[PDB]
Amino acid sequence: RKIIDTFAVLTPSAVSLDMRKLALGLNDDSSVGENTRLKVMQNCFEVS
């Protein structure tokens, strides 16, 4: 923790929104199956 805390200052420069939910498959609109989105967000809730 002491080796991971202080130096964490670097910030990646550019980010574009709506490019991660479009990649995981969880969203309000995707070509992948919709039978997982609820259980997938529950996993995200409680996946260590």
Binding site: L22, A23, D28, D29, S30, S31, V32, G33
Partner: protein, 446 residues
């Protein structure tokens, strides 16, 4: 839009030709080469016909003979609705797509299909968006008053489109280009009614686009896509990620076969439109024998877009083989294809091209500098003077006078060397720089 300030190749806009397929001596920048421009017009009529396939033509001859100018003129002269593939053959190698996969991707991208889809709309100022509860008798009493300038009308939501409006948080009064088979309602902003509202002072903050068309009308929307998008859709359930990032992943053959059948029957059913474009490639002498066999079979194939292939070098070594043949290509493909030779320029067309370059760069030249540039270019090459004009203009600013005078071109000539100057300078310094062995005699004395 299309941010590109200037280039040595941004000086031609649309080429120039006539209905007789005859060249224009000053055809919108590019000049001379009557055979080249007539052949360009012949190929233009060929591609407008859209009735032949598997044709390969070789732009032979010495380099600098307007070959890139010819390609650019053809590309800008054919017009829109026909995307091209103008990529040099050097970057065919990749760490994600094999040579066969890359060639197949190029070939399938060269041939396009337009698709007309009879999508719908519901346009009009939706002044209110009421979402009633899911009553048992009627599962959704959702009021929403879409009305254009022509009429006043109300509608009803079928318990599916409530979040379609507000997938992104928008309000009512938004022109909605709704699609029945989409589920993603697109809001165009704000809209107007034809009412004066209340009696006291008001009607403030209303200046937007008002709906103009009918409340509903069919739209046969046309979309143009290449085989790349369709194939990446076939390979993976999500295809936009690989279209953007670029990690398709060498899709398999039965996909291409089923797409072939599907496109054939779609054309037969009157739903799609075939657009058989033409592929452009460069540095064919550098191409390798496996690519030679690939194109050899492709030419004999029933589906093959026309080919614009050129070898700048003449009688050069054939890459991928142990033997050298004319054009860097063996006689098999050489006889299979057709040949158009290209010869060099005289000085006057260089002068005209440089004058066009100058007036494109909106610089007040003086004709003495132009004459010096013409002499320097004709002595060595066109590109020499094409850069000399710009550097002399820079020197013109550096001496605080707008006109490009003699001393600007003279300083440009003396400062930056020439190919003959460089070779003379290095052959007299055979023991001063790094050489074959790398022997550098830094020792000026002793």
């Amino acid at each position: 839009k299309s941010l590109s300030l200037i280039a040595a190749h941004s000086h031609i806009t649309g080429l120039g030709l006539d209905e007789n397929l005859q060249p224009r001596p000053t055809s919108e920048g590019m000049v001379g080469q009557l055979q080249a421009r007539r052949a360009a017009g012949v190929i233009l009529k060929m591609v407008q016909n859209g009735t032949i396939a598997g044709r390969a033509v070789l732009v032979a001859g010495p380099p600098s003979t307007g070959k890139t100018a010819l390609a650019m003129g053809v590309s800008q002269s054919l017009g829109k609705d026909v995307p091209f593939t103008a990529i040099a053959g050097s970057e065919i190698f990749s760490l994600e797509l094999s040579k066969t996969e890359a060639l197949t991707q190029a070939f399938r991208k060269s041939i396009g299909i337009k698709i007309k889809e009879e999508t719908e709309l519901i346009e009009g100022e939706v002044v209110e968006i009421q979402i009633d509860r899911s009553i048992t008798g009627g599962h959704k009493q959702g009021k929403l008053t879409i009305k254009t300038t022509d009429m006043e009308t109300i509608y009803e939501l079928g318990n599916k489109m409530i979040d379609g409006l507000t997938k992104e948080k928008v309000l009512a009064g938004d022109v909605i280009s709704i699609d029945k088979a989409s589920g993603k309602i697109t809001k165009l902003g704000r809209s107007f009614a034809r009412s004066r509202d209340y009696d006291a002072m008001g009607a403030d903050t209303r200046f937007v686009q008002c709906p103009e068309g009918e409340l509903q009308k069919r739209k046969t929307v046309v979309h143009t896509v290449s085989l790349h998008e369709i194939d990446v859709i076939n390979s993976r359930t999500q295809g936009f990620l690989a279209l953007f990032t670029g990690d398709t992943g060498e899709i398999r053959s039965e996909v291409r076969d089923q797409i072939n059948t599907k496109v054939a029957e779609w054309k037969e059913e009157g739903k799609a439109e075939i657009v058989p474009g033409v592929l452009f490639i460069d540095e064919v002498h550098m191409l390798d024998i496996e690519c030679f066999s690939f194109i050899n079979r492709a030419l004999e194939d029933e589906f093959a877009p026309i080919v614009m292939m050129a070898t700048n070098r003449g009688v050069s070594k054939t890459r991928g083989t142990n033997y050298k043949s004319p054009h860097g290509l063996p006689l098999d493909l050489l006889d299979r294809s057709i040949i158009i030779t290209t010869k060099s320029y005289n000085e006057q067309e260089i002068k005209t091209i440089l004058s066009i370059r100058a007036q494109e760069e909106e610089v007040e030249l003086s004709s003495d500098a132009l004459d010096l540039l013409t002499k320097t270019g004709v002595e060595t090459s066109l590109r020499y003077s094409s850069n000399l004009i710009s550097v002399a203009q820079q020197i013109a600013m550096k001496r605080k006078n707008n006109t490009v005078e003699v001393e600007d071109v003279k300083r440009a000539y003396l400062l930056f060397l020439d190919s003959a100057r460089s070779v003379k300078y290095v052959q007299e310094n055979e023991s001063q720089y790094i050489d074959d062995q790398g022997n550098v005699q830094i020792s000026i004395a002793k």
